[PDB]
Design an enzyme around this catalytic site. Structure first.
Site, PDB file in Angstrom:
ATOM      1  N   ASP A 160       0.755  -1.204  -0.008  1.00 36.81           N
ATOM      2  CA  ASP A 160       0.064  -0.049  -0.108  1.00 36.81           C
ATOM      3  C   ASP A 160       0.901   1.307   0.065  1.00 36.81           C
ATOM      4  OD1 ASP A 160      -1.975   2.110   0.038  1.00 36.81           O
ATOM      5  OD2 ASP A 160      -2.833   1.116   2.137  1.00 36.81           O
ATOM      6  N   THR A 161       1.271   1.840  -1.058  1.00 32.95           N
ATOM      7  CA  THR A 161       1.961   2.827  -1.133  1.00 32.95           C
ATOM      8  C   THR A 161       1.391   4.121  -0.816  1.00 32.95           C
ATOM      9  OG1 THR A 161       1.372   3.315  -3.640  1.00 32.95           O
ATOM     10  CG2 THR A 161       3.409   1.859  -3.104  1.00 32.95           C
ATOM     11  N   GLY A 162      -0.025   4.198  -0.570  1.00 37.11           N
ATOM     12  CA  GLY A 162      -0.695   5.281   0.056  1.00 37.11           C
ATOM     13  C   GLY A 162      -0.601   5.281   1.401  1.00 37.11           C
TER      14      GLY A 162
HETATM   15  C1  LIG Z   1      -6.489   0.385   4.953  1.00 37.77           C
HETATM   16  C2  LIG Z   1      -7.017   1.277   3.556  1.00 37.77           C
HETATM   17  C3  LIG Z   1      -6.790   0.883   2.069  1.00 37.77           C
HETATM   18  C4  LIG Z   1      -6.968  -0.537   1.898  1.00 37.77           C
HETATM   19  C5  LIG Z   1      -8.834  -0.945   2.073  1.00 37.77           C
HETATM   20  C6  LIG Z   1      -7.565   1.484   0.982  1.00 37.77           C
HETATM   21  N1  LIG Z   1      -7.238   3.197   1.246  1.00 37.77           N
HETATM   22  C7  LIG Z   1      -6.012   3.455   0.353  1.00 37.77           C
HETATM   23  C8  LIG Z   1      -4.784   3.825   1.425  1.00 37.77           C
HETATM   24  O1  LIG Z   1      -3.720   3.751   0.605  1.00 37.77           O
HETATM   25  C9  LIG Z   1      -4.980   5.101   2.232  1.00 37.77           C
HETATM   26  C10 LIG Z   1      -4.819   6.483   1.548  1.00 37.77           C
HETATM   27  C11 LIG Z   1      -4.958   7.435   2.246  1.00 37.77           C
HETATM   28  C12 LIG Z   1      -6.250   7.945   3.019  1.00 37.77           C
HETATM   29  C13 LIG Z   1      -6.525   9.082   4.061  1.00 37.77           C
HETATM   30  C14 LIG Z   1      -5.262  10.052   4.420  1.00 37.77           C
HETATM   31  C15 LIG Z   1      -3.805   9.768   3.643  1.00 37.77           C
HETATM   32  C16 LIG Z   1      -3.731   8.143   2.638  1.00 37.77           C
HETATM   33  N2  LIG Z   1      -4.053   5.033   3.341  1.00 37.77           N
HETATM   34  C17 LIG Z   1      -4.216   4.813   4.543  1.00 37.77           C
HETATM   35  O2  LIG Z   1      -5.267   4.623   5.314  1.00 37.77           O
HETATM   36  O3  LIG Z   1      -2.983   4.780   5.272  1.00 37.77           O
HETATM   37  C18 LIG Z   1      -2.738   4.742   6.834  1.00 37.77           C
HETATM   38  C19 LIG Z   1      -1.827   4.062   7.171  1.00 37.77           C
HETATM   39  O4  LIG Z   1      -0.719   4.909   7.228  1.00 37.77           O
HETATM   40  C20 LIG Z   1      -1.253   6.294   7.362  1.00 37.77           C
HETATM   41  O5  LIG Z   1      -0.793   7.155   6.148  1.00 37.77           O
HETATM   42  C21 LIG Z   1      -1.971   7.562   5.432  1.00 37.77           C
HETATM   43  C22 LIG Z   1      -2.841   7.174   6.184  1.00 37.77           C
HETATM   44  C23 LIG Z   1      -2.442   6.119   7.260  1.00 37.77           C
HETATM   45  S1  LIG Z   1      -8.626   4.314   1.325  1.00 37.77           S
HETATM   46  O6  LIG Z   1      -7.793   5.591   1.178  1.00 37.77           O
HETATM   47  O7  LIG Z   1      -9.303   3.954   2.708  1.00 37.77           O
HETATM   48  C24 LIG Z   1      -9.460   3.953  -0.277  1.00 37.77           C
HETATM   49  C25 LIG Z   1     -10.780   2.991   0.131  1.00 37.77           C
HETATM   50  C26 LIG Z   1     -11.696   2.878  -1.107  1.00 37.77           C
HETATM   51  C27 LIG Z   1     -11.084   3.303  -2.406  1.00 37.77           C
HETATM   52  C28 LIG Z   1     -12.063   3.077  -3.698  1.00 37.77           C
HETATM   53  C29 LIG Z   1     -13.448   2.822  -3.275  1.00 37.77           C
HETATM   54  O8  LIG Z   1     -11.357   1.792  -4.135  1.00 37.77           O
HETATM   55  C30 LIG Z   1      -9.869   4.125  -2.363  1.00 37.77           C
HETATM   56  C31 LIG Z   1      -8.947   4.474  -1.277  1.00 37.77           C
END
Ligand SMILES: CCC(CC)CN(C[C@@H](O)[C@H](Cc1ccccc1)NC(=O)O[C@H]1CO[C@H]2OCC[C@H]21)S(=O)(=O)c1ccc([C@H](C)O)cc1
Lengths: 99, 99
Positions: free
Chosen positions: A25-27
């Protein structure tokens, strides 16, 4: 390896001696795993995601193997919807994005 | 280019005629953008992550340019804290994970 993205980039990880599945998960800044038992001391912490903030248990300097690549770093444990490997460990295994 | 993961993989995008910064996010199936008033038909949706769900509006067949690479596909718009480029568009620009 090179990993294309037409499917979710799921990998098998090894942590605390048990195998699990997790998402590369690069995000994610941080690595967050669903509720599990882990040996060692931990401190309570908060992390925020797309929907708001959750309470987690922070384990520091945890050994984790990811597709046979070793990392030693912070693992957060709590009510994440999915096990995610974040950048704190992706950097340790040499992961880059390329296009 | 090659993007390392020491820092968030933030890139400049163009959508609806506007420039924005967005995360290249292998952990996201689909693309989620900050609230913006795009024209055209849409349908409401709820999407979930750490901390729970947010309500978004799903637009189909939206053109986004990512570092000069064109892509067209589904975009979800709502109160996300960050713009997120997900796998539906990362595939289109040739993006891979490598380690
Ligand atoms: C576990 C979540 C995953 C897997 C289900 C999915 N996610 C992407 C994930 O990369 C998020 C991206 C993010 C979200 C908010 C703020 C910064 C970055 N990152 C994240 O939560 O990281 C945490 C950990 O480290 C900390 O750094 C960052 C925040 C902290 S999502 O955003 O919920 C999402 C859900 C549905 C869709 C469509 C429907 O497909 C698209 C995107």
């Amino acid at each position: 390896p090179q990993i294309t993205l037409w499917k979710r980039p799921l990998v098998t990880i090894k942590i605390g001696g048990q195998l699990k599945e997790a998402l590369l998960d690069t995000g994610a800044d941080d690595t967050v795993l669903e509720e599990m038992n882990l040996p060692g001391r931990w401190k309570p912490k908060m992390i925020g995601g797309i929907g708001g903030f959750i309470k987690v248990r922070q384990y520091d300097q945890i050994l984790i193997e990811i597709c046979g690549h070793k990392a030693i770093g912070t693992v957060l444990v709590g009510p994440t919807p999915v096990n995610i490997i974040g950048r704190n460990l992706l950097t340790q295994i040499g992961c880059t994005l390329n296009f």
